[PDB]
Design a protein around this ligand. Structure first.
Ligand SMILES: Cc1c(O)cccc1C(=O)N[C@@H](CSc1ccccc1)[C@H](O)CN1C[C@H]2CCCC[C@H]2C[C@H]1C(=O)NC(C)(C)C
Lengths: 99, 99
């Protein structure tokens, strides 16, 4: 798809069998989702953005579908205001910025 | 142009005759630039990112040129680590996310 930006670029993703809405974010290096239980062992991690750092659980090799495209990568779970799909998964689905 | 996301999408912008590097961010609703003295009055404002809120100065009707493309809109100036070009300006240059 070609997504314009007059509105936030939110899309439906499927992860752990659940549908969730998430923001395509070229400014985020990582993918950070709201608190949820995923299978797998996880590692504590710290990530920062404007405002500061937050503690997150790092899950590796998680399967996630973004608008039907499959991606398998690291997903951070923690107290984010909104679900964010960062560059580690946007590259996997072949997403580019264009003008 | 088409910018891939292997690396952070940093591009050259020009504002008030000064060239600067800035991040194209579909996740940012606003444009936030590193501290700088712009003429004009401004309004105080608080914006939140991942770890919390920061105080910024809002300036209106600022002209920025992004890869030869002019945009004019509100810019927030505050102690950010990187200049962020948000959606309010990205839409003006016809920037789309494509996959
Ligand atoms: C989540 C994340 C990472 O995993 C790794 C690197 C950066 C980020 C990150 O938070 N990036 C942000 C840019 S701010 C930024 C700060 C430093 C470096 C690069 C970008 C997001 O792209 C945009 N970010 C998306 C999202 C983050 C959760 C809170 C709600 C928005 C807030 C918005 C944001 O911060 N907006 C401002 C107007 C304050 C700029």
């Amino acid at each position: 798809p070609q997504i314009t930006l007059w509105q936030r670029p939110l899309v439906t993703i499927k992860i752990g069998g659940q549908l969730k809405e998430a923001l395509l974010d070229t400014g985020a290096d990582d993918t950070v989702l709201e608190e949820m239980s995923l299978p797998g062992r996880w590692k504590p991690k710290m990530i920062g953005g404007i405002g500061g750092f937050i503690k997150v659980r790092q899950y590796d090799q998680i399967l996630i579908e973004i608008c039907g495209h499959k991606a398998i990568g690291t997903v951070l779970v923690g107290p984010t205001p909104v679900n964010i799909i960062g560059r580690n998964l946007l590259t996997q689905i072949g997403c580019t910025l264009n003008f």
